[PDB]
Amino acid sequence: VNSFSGYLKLTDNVYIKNADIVEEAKKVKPTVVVNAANVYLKHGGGVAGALNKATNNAMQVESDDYIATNGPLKVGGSCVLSGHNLAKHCLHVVGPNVNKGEDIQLLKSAYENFNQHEVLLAPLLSAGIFGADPIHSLRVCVDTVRTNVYLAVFDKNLYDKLVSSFL
């Protein structure tokens, strides 16, 4: 049992809140926080940059070692690294960068990684700088993830739209 509070129920297993994922992670200290990564684990902005800053760059230092050993992730792929001061683990997941021509269908493959974890605190993959339609990312999440996922949506206007859209 985790201390997640104030979430709206979307489905049996998907919950959503208008919150900063960093603040949710700090408060709840979940087993798994999801990062919306790129294949290089170069955590520059959005969720990744905010998570990394909250770790005082430890996430990036760890990621640099991961890449030196293993090379880049696949689009749609993932790796499990430490959650540092935020969570036990961070699941770094790469959605497609639709703005750079990557196939939106890979967003389903990206969300499938969530099924390897019983409970996750997560963002909407690809819905920010990667350019996927946010409601589409939410619908793929709902239709793909079967484990318990707590979605933190930073943007108030976006949240208000998402929660009054069909799934």
Residues near ligand AR6 (CB under 6 A)? 20-22, 36-38, 43-50, 95, 123-130, 134, 152-155
Q: Please, are residues 114 and 91 in contact by the beta-carbon 8 Å criterion?
A: yes
Q: Please, are residues 137 and 122 in contact by the beta-carbon 8 Å criterion?
A: no
3-state secondary structure 11-65: CCCEEEEECCHHHHHHHHCCCEEEEEECCCCCCCCHHHHHHHHHCCCHHHHHHHH
Work out how close the CB of 116 gets to ligand AR6 at its nearest, in angstroms, rounded to a whole number. Answer: 19
| Backbone phi, psi, residue 142, to 5° | -60, -40
- Beta-carbon contacts of 52 under 8 Å, excluding residues fewer than 6 positions away, are 43, 59, 60
Work out how close the CB of 11 gets to ligand AR6 at its nearest, in angstroms, rounded to a whole number. Answer: 19
Work out how close the CB of 94 gets to ligand AR6 at its nearest, in angstroms, rounded to a whole number. Answer: 8
Work out how close the CB of 90 gets to ligand AR6 at its nearest, in angstroms, rounded to a whole number. Answer: 13
Work out how close the CB of 162 gets to ligand AR6 at its nearest, in angstroms, rounded to a whole number. Answer: 9
1 or 33: CB nearest ligand AR6: 33
Residue nearest to ligand AR6 (CB): 128
Distances (CA, A) of 144 to 64, 82, 141: 30, 25, 5
24 or 117: CB nearest ligand AR6: 24
1 or 85: CB nearest ligand AR6: 85
| Backbone phi, psi, residue 120, to 5° | -140, 145
107 or 117: CB nearest ligand AR6: 107
38 or 78: CB nearest ligand AR6: 38
